Design a protein around this ligand. Structure first.
Ligand SMILES: CC(C)(O)c1cc(F)c2c(c1)C(=O)N(Cc1ccc(Cl)cn1)[C@@]2(OCC1(C(N)=O)CC1)c1ccc(Cl)cc1
Length: 92
């Protein structure tokens, strides 16, 4: 609803370090839809416990490969456009 379905359903090619992060949570291809990139990023965040019960909508990614890719120590999962922009920086 923040991001149009057509944009979510577009095939993208992750840059190599984003691909490394996706491959770490079982993703086995060179290209994905934006929606699949976001799914695997979700799986990664939940696996590495980059969250906190005190602030349940904040990803805490400082000193993690995710924080290096996105250029921030933390971000809000409610800011979908800002998150898409951070992912576009990591697509070929
Ligand atoms: C626990 C916490 C921090 O409140 C969290 C942690 C958490 F991992 C997620 C979310 C929320 C969430 O809402 N999600 C979906 C999402 C958000 C933004 C955009 Cl634009 C799209 N998709 C996340 O995924 C959900 C899951 C999945 N899809 O498998 C793990 C189950 C999520 C995914 C990617 C990024 Cl970059 C951020 C959040």
């Amino acid at each position: 609803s923040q991001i149009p379905a057509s944009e979510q359903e577009t095939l993208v090619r992750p840059k190599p370090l984003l691909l490394k992060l996706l491959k770490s949570v079982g993703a086995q291809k060179d290209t994905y839809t934006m929606k699949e990139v976001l799914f695997y990023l979700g799986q990664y965040i939940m696996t590495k416990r980059l969250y906190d019960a005190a602030q349940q909508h904040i990803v805490y990614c400082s000193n993690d490969l995710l924080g290096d890719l996105f250029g921030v120590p933390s971000f809000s999962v409610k800011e979908h456009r800002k998150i898409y922009t951070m992912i576009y920086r990591n697509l070929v």
